[PDB]
Design a protein around this nucleic acid. Structure first.
Length: 458
DNA sequence: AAAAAGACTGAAAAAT
DNA sequence: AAAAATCAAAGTCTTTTT
């Protein structure tokens, strides 16, 4: 269970489309052409992005072009058949202009809207869960627009539709006043599931996944998970030795399987690679993680740059960010990597008999609550802790120590670091927490800030 | 088993 | 005064369906 009482106001739907001004025009093959409202709206999306690289990608241009056409009238389809013939320049000029306008505004102008914004947030940015009011992270529904997929996402440029109340599922307690939908509408459904943490959800049309409206990080519901998250990592700390000794043993098994996971566990532990869940071949942008590494991403070097037994990792991880690395591994690991590449083709899984489910199942068996990602938290937290002891100058000046903080903070993000660690250091050294964590971080880390002392040790 | 369904960081805008 | 400086996709992991 996640709560007992949950009463909130529902989402803020996207502002309705504002038709272009008459003077603002669109040209096709030199000719002028007034676009159907729907076709117009979609075109503005593209127009506002002509100043962006997205518009230079062929995947984007095509995905946009096709989707735009599905919204055109029958005649528009007949005419507009070449993107290269469409002229969005004037539309583009307009929006840029509009943006300039908002920049060149009176303080009188600026303040009004600023207060306008405060009225929405005060009303729709909070909810009541149990005894207290809580802040909501994202209370507005994602506006329609063009999909900004990262990397070579095969769907970038696709049209994200406008979410109606009819697509919205509301969640709140049974005894709560149900938020009423916009006049003339209905929610998709209303449920009272005290097992989930979300207030609102809906299915996004581009990938068919479910989007949710949840609470601020400073939430008890959120905060509590984070607290639990670091605890789990602390527990790994104790069992890591036992764990490292076991997979270090599995490196010599008569079961490539036992060996496949062990090696992967190694990299994860040692290099902090991500689990690597399989992604839909042809529906997503190809990035990989540990378990999903392919033969082609690894290249072994018996000896290299004076280094002996080097593994040359070269692939695209999360967000299509390239991970290149030369890693001197332990012999049995290096060799095992040869065994794993034997008679395989590049386009093949390195860890053919392994997956995140399998791996995590094993980790769980080793310690309840242990999943791959825990190694990233654990590795990051411990490093900062130890680098803080080692680098903090015991007779320092508040600002330089903060440097020490950065230096310690170098070899190691607000996500993989038990905040209590920084909370401890700041007290022991009398460095105001305010000096490291800003208002919001203090908001978010209030729990670590209050339940940890100069004596804290991750 | 495994797929499918479900529940939890980048980058752009805003804050002399 | 003005200008220059400092939200939502994409993963992981769990639960349900097949």
């Amino acid at each position: 269970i996640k709560w007992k009482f949950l009463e909130h106001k529902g989402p803020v739907f996207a502002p309705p489309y504002e038709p272009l001004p008459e003077n603002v025009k669109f040209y096709y093959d030199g000719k002028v052409m007034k676009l159907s409202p729907k076709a117009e709206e979609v075109a503005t999306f593209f127009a506002k992005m002509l100043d962006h690289e997205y518009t230079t990608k062929e995947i984007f241009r095509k995905n946009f072009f096709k989707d735009w056409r599905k919204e055109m009238t029958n005649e528009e389809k007949n005419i507009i058949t070449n993107l290269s013939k469409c002229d969005f320049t004037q539309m583009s000029q307009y929006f840029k202009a509009q943006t300039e306008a908002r920049k060149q505004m009176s303080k009188e102008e600026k303040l009004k809207i600023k207060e306008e914004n405060e009225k929405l947030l005060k009303e729709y940015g909070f909810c009541i869960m149990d005894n207290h009011k809580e802040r909501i992270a994202n209370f507005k529904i994602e506006p329609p627009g063009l999909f900004r997929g990262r990397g070579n996402h095969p769907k970038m440029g696709m049209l994200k539709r406008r979410i109606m109340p009819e697509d919205i599922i509301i969640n709140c307690s049974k005894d709560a006043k149900v938020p009423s939908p916009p006049p003339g509408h209905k929610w998709k459904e209303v449920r009272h599931d005290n097992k989930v943490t979300w207030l609102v959800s809906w299915t996004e049309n581009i990938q068919g996944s479910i989007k949710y409206i949840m609470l601020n990080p400073s939430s008890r519901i959120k905060g509590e998970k984070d607290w639990q998250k670091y605890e789990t990592a602390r527990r790994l700390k104790k069992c890591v030795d036992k764990i490292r000794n076991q997979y270090r043993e599995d490196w010599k098994s008569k079961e490539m399987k036992v060996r496949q996971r062990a090696v992967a566990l190694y990299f994860i532990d040692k290099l902090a690679l991500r689990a690597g869940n399989e992604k839909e071949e042809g529906e997503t942008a190809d990035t990989v993680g540990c378990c999903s590494l392919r033969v082609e991403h690894i290249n072994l070097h018996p000896e290299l740059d004076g280094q002996e037994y080097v593994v040359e990792f070269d692939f695209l991880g999360k967000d299509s960010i390239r991970y290149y690395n030369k890693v001197p591994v332990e012999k049995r690991v290096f060799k095992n990597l040869q065994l794993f590449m034997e008679n395989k083709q590049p386009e093949d899984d390195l860890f053919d008999r392994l997956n995140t489910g399998i791996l995590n199942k094993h980790l769980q068996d080793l310690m309840e609550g242990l999943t791959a990602k825990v190694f990233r938290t654990y590795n990051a937290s411990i490093t900062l802790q130890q680098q803080l002891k080692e680098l903090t100058a015991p007779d320092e000046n508040i600002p330089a120590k903060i440097l020490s903080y950065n230096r310690a903070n170098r070899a190691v993000k607000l996500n993989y670091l038990d905040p209590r660690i920084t909370v401890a250091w700041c007290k022991k050294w009398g460095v105001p927490i305010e000096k490291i964590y800003n208002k919001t971080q203090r908001e978010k880390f209030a729990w670590a800030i209050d339940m940890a002392d100069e004596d804290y040790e991750f």
